[PDB]
Design a protein around this ligand. Structure first.
Ligand SMILES: CC(C)(COP(=O)(O)OP(=O)(O)OC[C@H]1O[C@@H](n2cnc3c(N)ncnc32)[C@H](O)[C@@H]1OP(=O)(O)O)[C@@H](O)C(=O)NCCC(=O)NCCSC(=O)/C=C/c1ccc(O)cc1
Length: 435
């Protein structure tokens, strides 16, 4: 259906104090992440478990003025967020820290309730909860951060975030949002951001020592409307799925990501009807912070995304989750300090990094992307009126792109949010539970 959603006011929000005016150099990983405003949506319920109103003692519940004041404070240490994209003399995209501000707006949905969104699948209707950005040829023209706070008939609220990917990855993006939340809640946030990105500069001279398959063009089909859905697997399902894989003494244990990813990859491949000899490539975003040595400063503010790309004939992936999980874990296992360091050097040698940008052509059939949010603090944004009951991607712009989401409660379930061709989704829906 098409929900009535009325925007009651838009406002640019600026840092509430002096911030540095500068150009901020972007690292190779900053430049190869997707070129969108990464969409996320938060839902907050007006009543708790037992039916108590979650409004504060002063009657507030996501009061706009308060949120904007806290936002302005947050933008002082996180000042690149209030910047704009630009290019350096060489044509390399950078951030112009010019305190141009972020878009904040409020909306009302007078006839819809949080419950109407059901499972919170990242449909184009869910995307309506994030402000829309008009992309022209002037890359400096739009804010890097847009936010909408939407109020519902039930008293509940959605916060829709869109964060231009050059500025921050998951950890750094949520570091900002959660810090904003902390300020709004009336507590100082624990970790000041570290802004300079030169720590991720390549070595001089660059000395790559791997082919870096992750930056090579993805396989094409050997010589359509995209559906979106979300699927929960209970702790017991994930257990049973793991128990299907032989775990023998002396064989290193597969990660839950590798097992689940093998399952998703196998199901998508079967649903797409891939022949056994069709190559297929799975794109796995990997956090460099856990891999680089010495570790980066705790508050490093930027992208530290490296990419693991298992690649196999569809025959290997569909033969079973055991075989697919092994291929994925091997690809993950490659992602150590020396590999991530080599990748920085490799990216430095490229004449034009915009060519390596991951987008529609990257994730589309016969390939796949599976971005884990399992260890991101997506449920910690408490602005003063409680923790969210759901957080997920606002939409999924590319076919073949999927997310692993952790549960908002303690049940240890995981959900897979995914986009596939409509004809293929109909099969995927059945296959993901058909084990
Ligand atoms: C993706 C990998 C390869 C797979 O891992 P994962 O699903 O994230 O899970 P982990 O494997 O790291 O952690 C799970 C394991 O760790 C264990 N564990 C688990 N939490 C614990 C614990 N607190 N204590 C101690 N043991 C534990 C847990 O038991 C579990 O064990 P096991 O079942 O044996 O696998 C992992 O290495 C990794 O790099 N994860 C991070 C990937 C990442 O950075 N994704 C974000 C990309 S950027 C993006 O999407 C941006 C979004 C965004 C969003 C909002 C914005 O505003 C802006 C942007």
């Amino acid at each position: 259906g098409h929900m009535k959603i009325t925007v009651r006011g838009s406002e640019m929000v600026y840092p509430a104090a002096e911030t540095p005016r500068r150009r901020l150099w972007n690292s190779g990983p900053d430049l190869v992440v997707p070129r969108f405003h990464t969409p996320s949506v938060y839902f907050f319920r007006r009543r708790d478990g037992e039916g108590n109103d979650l409004a504060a003692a002063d009657g507030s519940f996501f009061d706009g003025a308060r949120m904007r004041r806290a936002l302005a404070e947050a933008l002082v240490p996180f000042y690149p967020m209030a910047g704009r994209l630009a290019r350096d003399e060489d044509g390399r995209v950078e951030i112009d820290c010019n305190a141009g501000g972020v878009l904040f707006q409020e909306a009302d949905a007078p006839d819809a309730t949080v419950d109407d969104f059901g499972d919170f699948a990242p449909t184009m209707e869910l995307k309506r909860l994030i402000p829309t950005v008009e992309y022209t040829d002037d890359i400096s023209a739009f804010p890097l951060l847009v936010v909408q706070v939407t109020h519902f008939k039930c008293g509940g609220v959605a916060i829709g975030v869109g964060m231009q990917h050059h500025v921050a990855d998951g950890f750094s993006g949520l570091h900002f949002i959660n810090s904003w939340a902390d300020l709004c809640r009336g507590v100082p946030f624990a970790v000041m951001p570290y802004i300079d990105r030169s720590l991720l500069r390549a070595r001089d001279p660059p000395t790559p020592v791997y082919p870096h398959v992750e930056y090579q063009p993805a396989p094409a089909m050997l010589s359509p409307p995209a559906a979106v859905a979300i699927f929960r697997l209970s702790r017991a399902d994930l257990g049973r799925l793991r128990s299907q894989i032989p775990a023998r003494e002396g064989v290193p244990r597969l990660s839950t990501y590798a097992v689940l990813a093998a399952h998703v990859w196998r199901c998508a491949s079967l649903a797409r009807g891939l022949p056994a000899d069709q190559p297929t490539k799975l794109y796995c975003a990997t956090d460099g912070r856990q891999r680089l040595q010495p570790p980066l400063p705790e508050g490093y503010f930027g992208n530290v995304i490296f990419t693991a790309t298992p690649l196999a004939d569809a025959g290997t992936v569909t033969a079973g989750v055991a075989e697919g999980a092994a291929v994925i874990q091997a690809a993950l296992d490659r992602m150590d300090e020396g590999y991530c360091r080599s990748a920085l050097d490799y990216l430095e040698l490229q004449p034009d990094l915009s060519a390596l940008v991951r987008g529609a052509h990257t994730f589309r059939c016969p390939n796949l992307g599976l971005t884990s949010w399992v260890r991101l603090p997506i449920h910690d944004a408490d602005f003063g009126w409680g923790r969210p009951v759901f957080m997920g991607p606002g939409g999924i712009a590319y076919e073949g792109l999927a997310f692993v989401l952790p549960s908002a409660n303690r049940d240890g379930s995981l959900s897979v949010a995914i986009s596939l061709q409509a004809e293929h989704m109909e099969k995927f829906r059945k296959f993901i539970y058909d084990f």
